[PDB]
Design a protein around this ligand. Structure first.
Ligand code: 3PE
Ligand code: 3PE
Ligand code: 3PE
Ligand code: CL
Lengths: 176, 485, 106, 55, 100
């Protein structure tokens, strides 16, 4: 459990850094999937068996698939932005990095001053979560369907193509 | 708690709007019909407004651990339903010129309204988190409904990315609050802390990260840079909803949170909220002083009006008029905003591409659209807070709550901010009666649907004036709508 | 119990041997055997929509999975709640099919 | 000397400062979204820092 | 046993890394990717907290969070498609016409 938490916790931080600093979009997504698998191990180490599985079933097996689909559809990668590698230029990342560092320091300070009896790791099952979802949190599940419906309707409205054909040519203003 | 037959009556508004979302979607499935689908949406939203009567007769009750139905919930539910019916009446004339799928607009307005009703009854952090997303995700599509327009796409991309960032700060903050509390209910946030121990570092840090998310949605400095760009890019019908429903729905849940949460009476949070209010009141008016775009001007205006409301929140744990002030102020802001944004919608309908957003377009409105100029004048005076308008009665409440709470720096800001505001509000008002010989103005549509929008902005102006001279009726209703403490 | 510890080690070894076996076969192919000395276009968003629909429906199925393992404990109230959820899902599916968003051929 | 009402010009300073401040504040309204995101980052650090120094 | 503080620090590191990514990258794709790191980090914190208190509420909040991430990424990538189809450019700095 302890090894799993620290090893997976470290695999995640290292992979996440590779993602934000990578030039190749697909490689960045690969390191992002690696970090999601690492976070799934952290979830399992803490006893969150349901969250654990969902981390791989929905986040690294659906949301990420959609991202790869888009990168492969628009043939992303090798763009002037990813060729200039501006993010690597120190004058571009030093400022943002310092703001993030100060935010982390302040947050960590607050965390270090909290009561900590420790996380036992007793497994919380998906059955227990389901009893809660269809018991005290019933309105959440019903309204969550409406939220996903809104995503479906909006994504279709702005994501639908006006030009028919599996292969389309990139025209300015998508002129037909 | 479980869902008893009695609990189900208190959910009528949420259940009716939800059923409307389904029936309208099944109607679009059967056959796209702009008139029928718009009509079905309006009928469902009205039915929900009428159901509020039955909810009131039933009485205050906590349906589940996530929702508490009381007078406050009914009042804010009514406000969101009114601002949403208006959005629909203003959309039909505009969507008539939209040569593309138009039934989905009403479908999204309904789901966003469901978010506001949830936020009105929200008594749990989960409800707060879900309600904001139910009122934000539909708006991403509404702000970018005319994706073919460059400004509408820019507005949608800006809102989506910034709202997503704001939702992560909110969730992370709620997680840190949970790590210290152990309960996600508002009444338990700060309850486990002992005497003089309320300022627990992590509890304060969680609230601080939650304020970044809530402050963004309420366009409060320093999370306000998005307001002018999104308000201008979003289609005019949508701008009306973003300026009214979202702000009123989210400001209300924040009031309930700082009222029920024991940590709400933290001086550190109060002093931080006070700096945000002062900046929002001064920065909003100062940035609107030189605006030549009415949409951007009304954006900066929202920054200041929300700053005025925050003063009542800062004086919440010191008086009882604080809740009454916000109710009266938000009622006035609703009618005043529906009036100004609605006139912009009618002058931008039918959709012909870019909206009439330049102040030059309104430089002789009276000599073409007399009643529309008169309404805009009344709303400009109301938003300025000029006695004889409901806007002033809202400002009076804020100043009274502030004085009773000795918020002298904030009361001084309201006076300086209002003085700065008079310059731009009056400029837009007097402009309507100037003579613009240049007439590139488009002819008004001639259908009862367009005339209905004109009635909405007219009735809203009449209410702003009648309640501006005789406010006791509204004061009595808002006083009945009190949270179940 | 030694049983749970034994199963923990067995699962780890199975996973390590499985991935190790694949690497062995791949590295063997690379080593064993000799070797000769030696933008304008895009794919339709119809591919994205299918993936996006999959994501929405897959996340919706998560709730039904949690209900499935706890149907008896949730009782008839839970059934009524799930029924409403499944109806909304089917209603959206009907909408997608009727608007033609679910027909690959134009 | 007083032909141009000097005291009125003195009472117009509150309005000259206002216009100037407005133009300076509008300089942060560059349409750049990355700046808007950085603005929220800066705001978060300031809010959290104040909450800890006022705790 | 894992210290609750260690779990919360892991989430904070992944949150600040995701934010840094959203500000230093001009590509809309890398900005959307950065947001996914931020929302996943917030969901991880809820699971850590729920595990410390032994409550299913942490996993219930995680499910609501991943549902938003799925819906937000769906709409987010749809806007990216529209921008690419019309401007064949993902530099967010170019999407800055409205200002002042
Ligand atoms: C490179 C890969 C690195 C992977 C590191 C993490 C796995 C380390 C090896 C397995 C550790 C198992 C362990 O410590 O024991 C099982 C543990 C607790 O099981 P339990 O039955 O609750 O208690 C038994 C008595 N302690 O079980 C747990 O609490 C942890 C359960 C999940 C373990 C990890 C699951 C796979 C993670 C893959 C990450 C891939 C990243 C790329
Ligand atoms: C007769 C049947 C057929 C007709 C149906 C009705 C038709 C109209 C429907 C639309 C409007 C509905 C508004 C209903 C308001 C009255 C609700 C009510 O029952 O009021 C009393 C209620 C407390 O009732 P109870 O708990 O039974 O009292 C026990 C006392 N021992 O106390 C409350 O709950 C307080 C209610 C007032 C505050 C909330 C108001 C919400 C609705 C308005 C929102 C907008 C506000 C701004 C309006 C500005 C107008 C200028
Ligand atoms: C652009 C203009 C903006 C103007 C903004 C306001 C400017 C004035 C700010 C005054 C600040 C407070 C000064 C006094 C110290 C704090 C208050 C105090 O000690 O008493 C407050 C007074 C009495 O009540 P208190 O003492 O709180 O309670 C026990 C009563 N036995 O109860 C009170 O509430 C009285 C407070 C003093 C009078 C305040 C009203 C001043 C009106 C405007 C004056 C402008 C010119 C100067
Ligand atoms: Cl008229």
């Amino acid at each position: 459990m302890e090894f799993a938490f620290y090893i997976c916790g470290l695999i995640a931080i290292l992979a996440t850094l590779r993602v934000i600093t990578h030039t190749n979009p697909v490689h960045a997504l690969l390191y992002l999937i690696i970090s999601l698998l690492a976070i799934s191990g952290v979830f399992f180490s803490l006893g969150a068996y349901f969250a654990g599985a969902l981390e791989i079933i929905v986040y690294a097996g659906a949301i990420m698939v959609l991202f790869v689909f888009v990168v492969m559809m628009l043939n992303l990668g090798g763009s002037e932005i990813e060729q200039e590698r501006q993010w690597l230029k120190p004058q571009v990342w030093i400022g943002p990095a310092i703001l993030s560092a100060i935010m982390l320091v302040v947050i960590v300070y607050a965390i270090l001053g909290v009561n900590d009896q420790g996380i036992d790791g007793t497994p919380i099952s998906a059955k227990a979560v389901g009893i809660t979802l269809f018991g005290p949190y019933v309105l959440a599940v019903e309204l969550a369907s409406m939220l996903l419906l809104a995503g479906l309707v909006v994504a279709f409205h702005v994501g639908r193509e006006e030009r028919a054909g599996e292969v389309l040519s990139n025209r300015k203003d998508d002129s037909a | 708690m479980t869902i008893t037959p009695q609990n189900l009556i208190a959910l009528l508004p949420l259940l009716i709007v939800g059923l409307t979302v389904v029936v309208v979607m099944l109607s679009i499935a059967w056959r796209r019909n702009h008139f029928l689908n718009a009509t079905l949406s309006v009928i469902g939203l009205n039915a929900a407004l009428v159901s509020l009567w039955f909810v009131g007769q039933a009485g205050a009750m906590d349906v589940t651990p996530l929702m508490r139905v009381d007078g406050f919930a009914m009042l804010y539910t009514g406000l969101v339903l009114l601002a949403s019916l208006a959005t629909c009446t203003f959309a039909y004339p505009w969507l008539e010129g939209y040569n593309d799928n138009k039934d989905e607009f009403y479908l999204l307005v309904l789901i966003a309204a469901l978010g506001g009703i949830l936020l009105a009854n929200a008594n749990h952090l989960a409800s707060l988190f879900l309600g904001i997303e139910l009122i934000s995700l539909p708006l991403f599509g509404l702000v970018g409904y005319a994706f073919r327009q460059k400004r509408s796409l820019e507005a949608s991309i800006k809102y989506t990315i910034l709202s997503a960032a704001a939702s992560s700060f909110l969730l992370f903050g709620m997680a840190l609050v949970y790590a210290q509390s152990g309960d996600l209910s508002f009444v338990a946030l700060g309850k486990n802390l002992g005497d003089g121990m309320l300022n627990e570092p992590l509890l304060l840090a969680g609230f601080g990260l939650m304020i970044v998310g809530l402050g963004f949605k309420l366009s409060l400095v320093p999370f306000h840079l998005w307001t002018p760009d999104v308000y201008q890019g979003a289609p005019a019908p949508v701008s009306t909803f973003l300026a009214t429903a979202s702000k009123i729905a989210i400001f209300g849940v924040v009031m309930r949170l700082f009222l029920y949460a024991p940590v709400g009476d933290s001086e550190a949070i109060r002093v931080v909220l006070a700096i945000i209010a002062f900046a929002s009141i001064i920065f909003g008016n100062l940035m609107a002083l030189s605006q030549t775009n009415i949409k951007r001007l009304l954006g900066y205006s929202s920054i200041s009006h929300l700053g005025y409301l925050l003063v009542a929140l800062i004086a919440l744990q010191t008086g009882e008029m604080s809740m009454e002030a916000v109710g009266v102020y938000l009622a006035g802001y609703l009618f005043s905003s529906l009036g100004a944004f609605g006139v912009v919608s009618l002058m931008s309908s039918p959709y012909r591409g870019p909206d009439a957003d330049s102040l030059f377009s309104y430089r002789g409105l009276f000599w073409h659209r007399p009643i529309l100029a008169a309404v805009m004048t009344v709303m400009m005076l109301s938003l300025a807070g000029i006695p004889m308008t409901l806007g002033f009665i809202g400002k009076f409440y804020v100043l009274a709550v502030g004085v009773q709470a000795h918020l002298w720096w904030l009361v001084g800001a309201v006076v300086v901010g209002s003085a700065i505001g008079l310059y731009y509000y009056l400029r837009v008002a007097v402009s309507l009666y100037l003579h613009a010989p240049e007439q590139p103005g488009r002819d008004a549509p001639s259908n009862w649907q367009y005339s209905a929008g004109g009635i909405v902005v007219l009735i809203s102006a009449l209410l702003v004036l009648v309640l501006g001279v005789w406010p006791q009726p509204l004061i009595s209703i808002v006083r009945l709508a009190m949270p179940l403490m | 119990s030694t049983e749970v510890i034994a199963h923990h080690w067995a699962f780890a070894i199975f996973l390590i041997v499985a991935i190790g076996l694949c690497c062995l076969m791949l590295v063997g192919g690379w080593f064993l055997g000799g070797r000769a000395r030696a933008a304008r276009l895009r794919l339709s968003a119809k591919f994205y929509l299918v993936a996006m629909f999959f994501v929405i429906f897959d996340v919706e199925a998560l709730y039904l999975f949690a209900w499935s393992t706890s149907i008896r404990e949730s009782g008839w109230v839970g059934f009524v709640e799930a029924a409403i959820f499944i109806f909304v899902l089917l209603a959206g599916l009907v909408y997608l099919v009727r608007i033609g968003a679910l027909d690959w051929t134009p | 000397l007083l032909k141009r009402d000097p005291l009125n010009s003195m009472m117009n300073i509150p309005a000259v400062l206002s216009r100037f401040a407005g133009k300076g504040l509008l300089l942060s309204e560059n349409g750049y979204l990355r700046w808007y995101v950085a603005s929220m980052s800066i705001g978060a650090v300031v809010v959290l820092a104040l909450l800890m120094v006022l705790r | 046993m894992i210290p609750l503080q260690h779990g919360l620090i892991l989430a904070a590191i992944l949150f600040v890394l995701g934010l840094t990514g959203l500000v230093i990258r001009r590509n809309l794709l890398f900005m959307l990717i950065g947001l996914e790191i931020m929302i996943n980090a917030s969901a991880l914190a809820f699971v850590v907290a729920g595990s410390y208190w032994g409550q299913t509420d942490g996993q219930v909040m995680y499910i609501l969070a991943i549902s938003l991430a799925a819906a937000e990424a769906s709409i987010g990538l749809a806007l990216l498609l529209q921008l690419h189809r019309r401007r064949q450019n993902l530099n967010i700095d170019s999407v800055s016409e409205m200002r002042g």
